[PDB]
Amino acid sequence: IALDIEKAKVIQSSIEYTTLKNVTSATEIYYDPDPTSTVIEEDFDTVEAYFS
Amino acid sequence: SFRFCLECNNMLYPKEDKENQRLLYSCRNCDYTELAEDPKVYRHELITNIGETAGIVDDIGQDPTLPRSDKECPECHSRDCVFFQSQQRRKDTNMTLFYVCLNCKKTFRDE
Amino acid sequence: TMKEITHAISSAKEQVQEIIYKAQHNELELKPGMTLRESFEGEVSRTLNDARDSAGRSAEMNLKDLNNVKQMVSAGSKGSFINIAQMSACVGQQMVEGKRIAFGFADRSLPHF
Ligand SMILES: [Zn+2]
Ligand SMILES: [Zn+2]
């Protein structure tokens, strides 16, 4: 690992601390009274694909 | 953005009906209740870019301490302009320039 | 030698101008563990330090053996290379708290800029 850069980078990634807040960009709260469907149109396709 | 009560000017907190399954903005100081238009109750930006270009005034061309360039205006193609960096002053802030024309007074970049 | 020193300082200032343009067009490489502003400041400071060292080295190579400052520096009794550089070629960059002169006014160092 000391003479190889890729394995060293793998070890570095495995050591460094990473929280959810680091990768998160924005969080939102929405009102949706239908458990099996949704009001948002952008995500409607993906969630209906999941449920089906 | 949050709305205010139309009768006693207090804040309209969101409320949910168990029987009707609707989102309603209701004032806790009275019985007033108005139907909500959007379900976006709350939004938090961990990384934000607001205030970077929001610090702009319409009289910034009268400041004598600002540098003057000859960059081309995208709208009226003037030959004089005034530039400055980002008004946000965090440690992560970029060093990109904002140019202001002396005729239309709009803010535009160089990219 | 004065022509050579002036050429070195002018070339360094042109290099600093190029670094400024690159940082103002998002074309600057970020040193790991440091922000864009910190990397830009460090790179400009390194360029200016190299400029002063090059000008001083030119000035110190110019000196004859009969030069008295050279004789004192070569004896090791008083003075060093930086003294010759600052006396003859260039004083260099002034650092306050390990950084260049800050913007004590509103976004400038003096009301003459
Ligand atoms: Zn009310
Ligand atoms: Zn214009």
Give residue for tokens 């490489």. Answer: C29
Q: Give residues 7 to 66 of B whose Cβ lies within 8 Å of A.
A: 14, 16, 21-23, 36, 39-47
- Per the document, the length of chain B is 111
Q: How far apart are CA C19 and CA C41, in angstroms?
A: 10
Q: How far apart are CA B62 and CA C75, in angstroms?
A: 61
User: What dihedral do alpha carbons C49, C54, C56, C57 form, nearest 10°?
Assistant: 140
Q: Would you call B44 and A28 a contact, using CB atoms and an 8 Å cutoff? A: yes
Q: Resolution, rounded to a tenth of an Å?
A: 3.6
Q: How far apart are CA A43 and CA A36, in angstroms?
A: 13
3-class SS of residue B100: strand
Beta bridge partners of B4: B11
* Listed residue (C72, C100, C96) closest to C84, CA to CA: C72
Give residue for tokens 């790179």. Answer: C43
Q: How far apart are CA B100 and CA C57, in angstroms?
A: 45
Residue type, C46: R
Taking phi over 0 as left and psi of -120 to 50 as alpha, with beta for the rest, B9 belongs to left
Task: Tell me the ligand closest to B34's alpha carbon.
Answer: 1
Give the number of C-alpha atoms closer than 13 A to the C-alpha of residue B39, restricted to the C-beta side: 14
Beta bridge partners of B40: A30
Q: Is B23 exposed, middle or buried (0-12, 13-18, 19+ CB in 10 A)?
A: buried
Q: Is C89 exposed, middle or buried (0-12, 13-18, 19+ CB in 10 A)?
A: buried
Taking phi over 0 as left and psi of -120 to 50 as alpha, with beta for the rest, A26 belongs to beta
Q: How far apart are CA C53 and CA C46, in angstroms?
A: 11
B90 at interface of A, judged by CB pairs closer than 8 A: no
Contact B50, B57 (CB under 8 A): no
Method: cryo-EM
Q: Domains in chain B and their CATH numbers?
A: 1-44 (2.20.25.10), 45-111 (2.20.25.10)
- Per the document, the length of chain A is 52
Q: How far apart are CA C100 and CA C113, in angstroms?
A: 16
Which residues fall within 8 angstroms of residue B86, CB to CB, at 6 or more apart? B52, B53, B93, B94, B95, B96, B98
- Tell me the H-state helices in B1-111: none
* Listed residue (B58, B65, B50, B55) closest to B106, CA to CA: B58
- Smallest Cα distance from B56 to chain A, Å: 26
| C-alpha torsion sign, points A12, A14, A18, A22 | positive
Give phi and psi for A21, each to the nearest 5. Answer: -60, -25
Beta bridge partners of B26: B13, B33
| Exposure string over A5-34, b if 16+ CB within 10 A, otherwise e | eeeeeeeeeeeeeeeeeeeeeeeeeeeeee
